[PDB]
């Protein structure tokens, strides 16, 4: 399954190439690194504590979890009436963490052809795995999670 450049006529392998990901999956990555401090979110202290302690803390202080012998939480879902500060907290987490961030949207994964959506999902997770510790944010989850 690797990707290799070969001679046009001799068909001899000459160079091993970087993996290939869909253009959409590549666009899913964050390069501008938003700038929103936790202080810019008011009214949410328990929720911010939960999100940071579930996402950021395992990446930095993995020693605490390894010593206590407990696996870190797997996944955080944010729900509430519109305008309650969910995408804002996601942006704040992306700004404050320096690990790879993969922004994603629910409707972004629904595709015309059959199998393309699953292909996109698995490619996105593959890219996240390749690029060190990473965070995947799936906004508008209700588009596909019905």
């Amino acid at each position: 399954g690797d990707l290799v450049g070969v001679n046009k006529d001799s068909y001899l392998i000459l160079e091993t190439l970087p993996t290939e990901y869909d253009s959409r999956v590549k666009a899913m990555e964050v390069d501008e690194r938003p700038t929103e401090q936790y202080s810019d979110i008011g009214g949410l202290d328990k929720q911010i504590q939960e999100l940071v302690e579930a996402i950021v803390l395992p990446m930095n202080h993995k020693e605490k979890f390894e010593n206590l012998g407990i696996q870190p939480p797997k996944g955080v879902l944010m729900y509430g009436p519109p305008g309650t500060g969910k995408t804002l907290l996601a942006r704040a987490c992306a700004a404050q963490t320096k690990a790879t961030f993969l922004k994603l949207a629910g409707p972004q994964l629904v595709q015309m052809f059959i199998g393309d959506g699953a292909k996109l999902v698995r490619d996105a997770f593959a890219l996240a795995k390749e690029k060190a510790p990473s965070i995947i944010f799936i906004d508008e989850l209700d588009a596909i999670g019905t």
Partner: peptide
């Protein structure tokens, strides 16, 4: 789903 994509574009992470 089209509406949700419109909402996400209008206001979202990016």
């Amino acid at each position: 789903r089209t509406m949700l994509e419109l909402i996400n574009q209008l206001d979202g992470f990016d």
